[PDB]
């Protein structure tokens, strides 16, 4: 009963159509957030909901890392640790990657173009590979 | 890097509140849902705390999904428990707190929340010998 993208005019399916390879690495997203938007990230401002989403994602994923470390330290038997860390890192982190890329892109270029990029990418992917144009559309600037 | 900064509060200001005197999870869930479902469901975008809560509920949903998945697999009963107990008890303190904060700031206005939060620090500091019997409630 929650549509996080509904507050910006997008829906879950729009991003769900996006394959996993397209999103960057988590380290890349964190480094971008640190380097390019640190000054105003801590400072207080009105509106700017994207700032609030980024701030809460960073806390959520920090808490997840703390959980990973805590489970690594305990649980003497190494067998479970592999499965636990795999599920926590690769599977659960997909949503974090999903949200971080969406909001970071929204900040740099705004809703005006990201939505059109999404609809165009969906149109490109839906068709079969045989008649698909050479390369995937690029967001560009 | 600061959970609340932009509400005129600090993580150190909430320290005075003891961990035990918080409310239970399901009560905050119900209090938010029943009262402010309509507020959740609107096209208007304002009151950042609205979206913040939307993030809190999403995080809780993800954690519950992890809990059920662990319940499904990991036959070893001891580890399964341990993980279930940890996720249930230790993992929810921050979320909770967040819920107490917002839910409680959309209902009583901010200034009333900031007053209650600085005053409650008085209660713990005073000695029981001459401390007043009752503690302060948010009221309205």
């Amino acid at each position, epitope marked *: 009963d929650i549509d996080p993208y509904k507050e910006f005019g997008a829906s879950v399916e729009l991003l769900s159509f996006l394959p996993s390879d397209f999103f960057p690495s988590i380290r890349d997203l964190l480094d971008t957030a640190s380097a390019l938007y640190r000054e105003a990230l801590e400072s207080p401002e009105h509106c700017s909901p994207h700032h609030t989403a980024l701030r809460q994602a960073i806390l959520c994923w920090g808490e997840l890392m703390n959980l990973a470390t805590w489970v690594g330290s305990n649980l*003497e*038997d190494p*067998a*479970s640790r592999e*499965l636990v860390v795999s599920y926590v890192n690769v599977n659960m982190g997909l949503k974090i990657r999903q949200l971080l890329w969406f909001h970071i892109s929204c900040l740099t270029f705004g809703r005006e173009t990201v939505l059109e990029y999404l609809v165009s990418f969906g149109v490109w992917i839906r068709t079969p590979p045989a008649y698909r144009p050479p390369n995937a559309p690029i967001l560009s600037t | 890097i600061d959970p609340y900064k932009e509400f005129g509060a600090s993580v150190e200001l909430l320290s005075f509140l003891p961990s035990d005197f918080f409310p239970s999870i399901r009560d905050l869930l119900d209090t938010a849902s029943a009262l402010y479902r309509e507020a959740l469901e609107s096209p208007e975008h304002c009151s950042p705390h609205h979206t913040a809560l939307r993030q809190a509920i999403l995080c809780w949903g993800e954690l519950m999904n992890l809990a059920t998945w662990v319940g499904s*697999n990991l*036959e*070893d*009963p*001891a580890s399964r428990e341990l993980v279930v107990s940890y996720v249930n008890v230790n993992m929810g303190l921050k979320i909770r707190q967040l819920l107490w904060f917002h839910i409680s700031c959309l209902t009583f206005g901010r200034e009333t929340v900031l007053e209650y939060l600085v005053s409650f620090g008085v209660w713990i500091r005073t000695p029981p010998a001459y401390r007043p019997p009752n503690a302060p409630i948010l009221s309205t």
Partner: antibody
Framework: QVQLVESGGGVVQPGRSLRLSCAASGFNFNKFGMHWVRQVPGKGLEWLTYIWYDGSNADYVDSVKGRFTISRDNSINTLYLQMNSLRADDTAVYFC????????????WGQGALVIVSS | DIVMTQSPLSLAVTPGEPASISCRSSQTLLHNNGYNYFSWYLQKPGQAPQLLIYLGSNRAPGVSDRFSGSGSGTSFTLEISRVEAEDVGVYYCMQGRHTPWTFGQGTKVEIKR
């Protein structure tokens, strides 16, 4: 490396009941499970029963179902296997082991003790 | 409940040559974790059993590399690249998908006379 030593093995007169001793040390007994393994001469290994750390649950095989019981005393970290209604087909050497590769295969096996019944 | 099976019953190896032994199980062992619960044990006369392969395809700690195995589902095989004089014994395979636990029939090795 953990070292486990059993005791109580020996000859028992027919028709009676006997109890075997299997104590362990050097690791967290409360955090792992225990298993019982049997070997009559001429055949291979056979699984009998096991108990979880809490001890609330237990399982048994159909051969000895309802006639054997297992219990643990976490205060002293000692295993217990009680034998009643012994038969001539029960003459075998008994081993108690522990498994920790994700709760599947036994890892450290005790030295074992033989139980013999005859007149 | 599970019916276990092993083959061949005996296999005499000239030492220094490779050999393979096959153990088969009735019901599938692929759990939802992508793992298979199957075991490889080694037993010596007058001694306690020792571990060979764990979790289907992972070597137990301290075991020499001379033994290797692989497989998935209902088929598995134990392979020994080079046979040494200390490798004589009876080998076992076990199941741990569903309780109760069941063992195989055994496989004893020796030197071809």
């Amino acid at each position: 490396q953990v070292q486990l030593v059993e005791s109580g093995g020996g000859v028992v007169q027919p028709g009676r009941s006997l109890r075997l001793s299997c104590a362990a040390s050097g690791f967290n007994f409360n955090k792992f499970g225990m298993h019982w393994v049997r070997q009559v001469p001429g055949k291979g290994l056979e699984w009998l029963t096991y108990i979880w750390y809490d001890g609330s649950n237990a399982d048994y095989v159909d051969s000895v179902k309802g006639r054997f019981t297992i219990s643990r005393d976490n205060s002293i970290n000692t295993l217990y296997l009680q034998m009643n209604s012994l038969r001539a087909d029960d003459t075998a050497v008994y081993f108690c082991a522990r498994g920790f590769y994700d709760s599947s295969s036994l890892e450290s096996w005790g030295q074992g003790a033989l139980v013999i019944v005859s007149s | 409940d599970i019916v276990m099976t092993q083959s061949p019953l005996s296999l005499a190896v000239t030492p220094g040559e490779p050999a393979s032994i096959s153990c088969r199980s009735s019901q599938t062992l692929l759990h939802n974790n992508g793992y298979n619960y199957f075991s490889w044990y080694l037993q010596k006369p007058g001694q306690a059993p020792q571990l060979l392969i764990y979790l289907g395809s992972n070597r137990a700690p301290g075991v020499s590399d001379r033994f290797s195995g692989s497989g998935s589902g209902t088929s598995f095989t134990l392979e020994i690249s080079r046979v040494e004089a200390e490798d004589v014994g009876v080998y076992y395979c076990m199941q741990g998908r569903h309780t109760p636990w069941t063992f195989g029939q055994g496989t004893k090795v020796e030197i071809k006379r």
